[PDB]
Amino acid sequence: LHKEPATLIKAIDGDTVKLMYKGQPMTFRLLLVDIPETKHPKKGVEKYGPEASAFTKKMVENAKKIEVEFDKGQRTDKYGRGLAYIYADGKMVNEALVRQGLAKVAYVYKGNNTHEQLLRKAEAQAKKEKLNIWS
């Protein structure tokens, strides 16, 4: 896997970020995480969704360096979002969210599983600490 530079344009949600990637604007879905979504057809703003969205926001807004890492499977979903691991100053946003108890590890989508064990590891620890969603 290779990291590539990107530039923040806008954080959208705990799990979606808009980035300037290779000269063009692109929406990215974070790989292997499932959030208590704030963007839902008809709900009330899911429990921990606001905190997850704020966490992602602060992490990418505060970073000096954003990098994108595509996995070896399919690179976009049916909505045209890039499927990737995102790093903020060398730290994986996907893993931080899970480690902090602000996301669960999702099912593997189309061969994209390189950091699955790493994330499952992080999720175990958050559950063990009864963090946030696991409280």
From Swiss-Prot:
Compositionally skewed regions (Basic and acidic residues) per UniProt: 115-131
Subcellular location: Secreted
Residue numbers annotated as active site: 29, 37, 81
Segments for region (Disordered): 115-135
List of residues binding Ca(2+): 15, 34-35
Protein name: Nuclease A
Taxonomic source organism: Staphylococcus aureus
Residues of the full protein shown: 89 to 223 of 231
